[PDB]
């Protein structure tokens, strides 16, 4: 926070303008509120509940990223590290510090900002953000069939059925090579 002439002093804040930031545990409520609309309203299920969301943001916030429109969180990606080729049920609530794959637990864009290319900018951004981390050689996520062609535009490849079941839902596993 540059104050020319005053080295250790931090400059006051004013409203920012579109930025990408790691999410904080305090941003958890805003995530779950988007998840209510985005996931819970269609399937009656969602990737992470508030507690689970807060967990990953306290444990590994650097594996998360959100697009903030002038201070408002409108799109996110909550992740953690995994240490196996395939995703398993138990990996939903696990973060493996010495893992090698960035496990994207949830990705969602606020309904009033969808179809503007913002979800893609975020995903691309996230792949670069985590790809830069010296141990993360791959990215993994599960999605329903409809979103498979979408994710292939980012380098993800179909890895068949995902061993993870959420409620009464089944998904296709996707793998994306990075470093």
């Amino acid at each position: 926070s540059g104050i020319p002439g005053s080295p250790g002093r931090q400059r006051r804040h004013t409203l920012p303008a579109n930025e990408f930031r790691c999410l904080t545990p305090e941003d958890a409520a805003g995530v779950f509120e988007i998840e209510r609309e985005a996931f819970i309203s269609v399937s009656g299920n969602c990737p992470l509940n508030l507690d689970e969301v807060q967990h990953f943001l306290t444990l590994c916030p650097e594996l998360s990223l959100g697009w903030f429109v002038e201070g408002r969180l409108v799109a996110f990606i909550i992740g953690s590290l995994w240490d196996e080729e395939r995703l398993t049920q138990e990996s939903l609530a696990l973060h493996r510090p010495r893992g090698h794959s960035a496990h994207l637990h949830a990705l969602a864009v606020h309904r009033s900002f969808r179809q503007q290319g913002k979800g893609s900018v975020l995903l691309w951004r996230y792949l670069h953000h985590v790809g830069a981390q010296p141990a993360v050689r791959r990215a993994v996520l599960m999605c329903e069939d409809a979103l498979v062609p979408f994710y292939q535009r980012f380098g993800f490849h179909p890895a068949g059925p995902c061993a993870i079941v959420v409620g009464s839902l089944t998904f296709t596993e996707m793998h994306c090579s990075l470093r």
Binding site: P4, A17, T24, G30, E70, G71
Partner: protein, 227 residues
């Protein structure tokens, strides 16, 4: 074509060429049609970036200038360059202020739009105020305060304490009091009240209680901690 301009604008933002992005959004605004929320964000972001660049260069060349003690000539170099930057800065402000007065505020149908553009008006007069001198200053500072005050007024009536736009205005308006008006106490009141009311609404557990503006709140408390 309006679409092409927006498409090129979203392109320039990614290419990090904000002066281009601003030019595109200035053209879209000049077709007299009310901007969509997306187009509005694009315009705000283009300009916040275009002007912020000059503001940053200004602060550094000013610091250098006041630290050039003794060297009349080396200090005059910074003086002239700073002025060169101030003209650039002045033009940018007048640009958006004109856009505001001619298309943005007149087309503002909703209160959310009226407060956004009114805050934006206070914003640019503030930036203009950061470099003003002479008698021009007293006037610029009033212009800023009156736009901010009107937005604040509407904000209190039509927006929830946790609304991102209501909260953003709180932040910028309190900073206006703090550094432009030298009124620490009032500045802190503005900020604390806003933060506390937002916290109050959230403590009720309402789906309506935004939770989208977490950042603008952290920003507010940081400023408080600072002051």
């Amino acid at each position: 074509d309006k679409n092409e301009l927006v498409q090129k604008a979203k392109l320039a933002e990614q290419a990090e060429r904000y002066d281009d992005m601003a030019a595109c959004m200035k053209s879209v605004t000049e077709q007299g049609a009310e901007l969509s929320n997306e187009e509005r964000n694009l315009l705000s972001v283009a300009y916040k970036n275009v002007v912020g660049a000059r503001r940053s260069s200004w602060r550094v060349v000013s610091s250098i200038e006041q630290k050039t003690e003794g060297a009349e000539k080396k200090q005059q170099m910074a003086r002239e360059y700073r002025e060169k930057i101030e003209t650039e800065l002045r033009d940018i402000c007048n640009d958006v202020l004109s856009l505001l007065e001619k298309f943005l505020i007149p087309n503002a149908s909703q209160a959310e739009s009226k407060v956004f553009y009114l805050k934006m008006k206070g914003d640019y007069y503030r930036y203009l105020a950061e470099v003003a001198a002479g008698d021009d200053k007293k006037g610029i500072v009033d212009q800023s305060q009156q736009a901010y005050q009107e937005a604040f007024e509407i904000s209190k009536k039509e927006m929830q304490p946790t609304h991102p736009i209501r909260l953003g205005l709180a932040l910028n308006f309190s900073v206006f009091y703090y550094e432009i008006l030298n009124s620490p106490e009032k500045a802190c009141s503005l900020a604390k009240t806003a933060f506390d009311e937002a916290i109050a609404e959230l403590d009720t557990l309402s789906e309506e209680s935004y939770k989208d503006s977490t950042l603008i709140m952290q920003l507010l408390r940081d400023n408080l901690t600072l002051w």
